[PDB]
Amino acid sequence: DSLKWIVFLLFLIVLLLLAIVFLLR
Amino acid sequence: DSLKWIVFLLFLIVLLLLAIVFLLR
Amino acid sequence: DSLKWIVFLLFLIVLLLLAIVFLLR
Amino acid sequence: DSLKWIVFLLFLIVLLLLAIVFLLRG
Amino acid sequence: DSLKWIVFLLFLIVLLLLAIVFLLR
């Protein structure tokens, strides 16, 4: 489903932003 | 429904971006 | 509604990304 | 509509992330 | 299709965040 695609991509984005947050510090 | 998950993940993304802003500042 | 809150959060995300670009410039 | 607003915001986000990439690369 | 545009833009965002992480490391 399109909304499930959106949720999965947003979860990937959350993971990548967490990685960036911990790469900065 | 997945609108709730979308809003939850967008909220997480806002929090992570604000964290990045404070880390850069 | 959920759509309005999604738009609001994406607007916040754009603002935070502008803050990031400004801090990086 | 709200879907077009979301598309505009996501496109601006893509452009800003491209700006960040172009800033970090060189 | 608007949802297709949303999914594709989020996929591009995932790719760009991947590139950002790769440049940060």
C-alpha A7/C-alpha B7 separation (Å) is: 9
Resolution in A: 2.5
DSSP of E1-25: -HHHHHHHHHHHHHHHHHHHHHHH-
Residue B21 touches partner C, C-beta closer than 8 Å: yes
Report yes or no on chains B and D touching (3+ CB pairs under 8 A). no
Cα-Cα end-to-end distance for chain E: 37
Q: Which residue of chain E comes nearest to D18, CA vs CA?
A: E16
Report the residue of E17, E23, E24 to disrupt the A interface, i.e. the one with the largest count of A CBs within 10 Å. Answer: E17
Report the run of H or E that residue A9 belongs to, with start and end. Answer: helix A2-24
User: Using CA atoms, how far apart are residues C14 and D19, in angstroms rounded to an integer?
Assistant: 13
In E, minimum Cα distance to A19 occurs at E21
Kindly give, in sequence order, each residue whose CB lies less than 8 Å from that of residue D22, ignoring residues fewer than 6 positions away.
none
Q: After which residue numbers is chain E interrupted with C–N beyond 2.5 angstroms?
A: none
